[PDB]
């Protein structure tokens, strides 16, 4: 679920900015997206979006109001290391996996301030 994705990110990037949740980043970091990612970080988000899209296409899975972000799962954090619980059901494991990979991807990408709250309608 969305709130778990945020904690997962805190887990991988302890020095994250709490107020960052109020803003969007690049072309894909945020609800929806358009065009092509502007940088590595943005790519991580697009990929995560794509991962959720695949989640919505799983024949055996249908989420509340069709939003994968509502699906809560179980996971643990240890030394900035994320682990999805094997007890998660297939749908939850798929979502937990998308989040884990995205969080890891975020931790390795450069944060470019110029892309914060980008004028998407013009550069995306
Ligand atoms: C983890 C990312 C920032 C990394 C960073 O702050 N590096 C600097 C570290 S340091 O000071 O130099 O130590 C931030 C950039 C924009 C953020 C995204 C945007 O805020 C858009 C949404 C907001 C939602 O609440 C959570 C998912 C999300 C899709 C966020 C995931 C994550 O929190 C992102 C991808
Ligand atoms: Ca998005
Ligand atoms: Ca269902
Ligand atoms: Ca659940
Ligand atoms: Cl989002
Ligand atoms: Cl349902
Ligand atoms: Cl459900």
Curated annotation (Swiss-Prot):
Disulfide bonds join 11-77, 27-124, 29-45, 44-105, 51-98, 61-91, 84-96. A lipid is attached at residue 56 (N6-palmitoyl lysine). It comes from Sus scrofa (Pig). Its cofactor is Ca(2+). Belongs to the phospholipase A2 family. The keyword Endoplasmic reticulum does not apply. GO terms for molecular function: bile acid binding; calcium ion binding; calcium-dependent phospholipase A2 activity; phospholipase A2 activity; phospholipid binding; signaling receptor binding. Its EC number is 3.1.1.4. Regulated by bile acid salts. Up-regulated by cholate and down-regulated by taurochenodeoxycholate. Acylation causes dimerization. Activated by trypsin cleavage in the duodenum. Can also be activated by thrombin or autocatalytically. Binds 1 Ca(2+) ion per subunit. GO terms for biological process: cellular response to insulin stimulus; fatty acid biosynthetic process; intracellular signal transduction; leukotriene biosynthetic process; lipid catabolic process; neutrophil chemotaxis; neutrophil mediated immunity; phosphatidylcholine metabolic process. Monomer or homodimer. Loss of activity upon alkylation of His-48 with p-bromo phenacyl bromide; Ca(2+) and Ba(2+) protect against inactivation. Ca(2+) binds at residues 28, 30, 32, 49. GO terms for cellular component: cell surface; extracellular region. The active site is at residues 48, 99. It is found in: Secreted. This is Phospholipase A2, major isoenzyme. Keywords: Autocatalytic cleavage, Calcium, Disulfide bond, Hydrolase, Lipid metabolism, Lipoprotein, Metal-binding, Palmitate, Phospholipid metabolism, Pyrrolidone carboxylic acid, Secreted, Signal, Zymogen. Its main location: secreted. It comes from the Eukaryota. Secretory calcium-dependent phospholipase A2 that primarily targets dietary phospholipids in the intestinal tract. Hydrolyzes the ester bond of the fatty acyl group attached at sn-2 position of phospholipids (phospholipase A2 activity) with preference for phosphatidylethanolamines and phosphatidylglycerols over phosphatidylcholines. May play a role in the biosynthesis of N-acyl ethanolamines that regulate energy metabolism and inflammation in the intestinal tract. It catalyses: a 1,2-diacyl-sn-glycero-3-phosphocholine + H2O = a 1-acyl-sn-glycero-3-phosphocholine + a fatty acid + H(+); 1,2-ditetradecanoyl-sn-glycero-3-phosphocholine + H2O = 2-tetradecanoyl-sn-glycero-3-phosphocholine + tetradecanoate + H(+); 1,2-dihexadecanoyl-sn-glycero-3-phosphocholine + H2O = 1-hexadecanoyl-sn-glycero-3-phosphocholine + hexadecanoate + H(+); 1-hexadecanoyl-2-(9Z-octadecenoyl)-sn-glycero-3-phosphocholine + H2O = 1-hexadecanoyl-sn-glycero-3-phosphocholine + (9Z)-octadecenoate + H(+).
């Amino acid at each position: 679920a969305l709130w778990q994705f945020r904690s997962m990110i805190k887990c991988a990037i302890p020095g994250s900015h709490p107020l960052m949740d109020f803003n969007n980043y690049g072309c894909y970091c945020g609800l929806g997206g358009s065009g092509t990612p502007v940088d590595e970080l943005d790519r991580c988000c697009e990929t995560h979006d794509n991962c959720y899209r695949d989640a919505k296409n799983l024949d055996s899975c249908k989420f509340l109001v069709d939003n994968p972000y509502t699906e809560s799962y179980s996971y643990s954090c240890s030394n900035t290391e994320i682990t999805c619980n094997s007890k998660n059901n297939a749908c939850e494991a798929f979502i937990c996996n998308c989040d884990r990979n995205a969080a890891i991807c975020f931790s390795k990408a450069p944060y470019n301030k110029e892309h914060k709250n980008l004028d998407t309608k013009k550069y995306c």
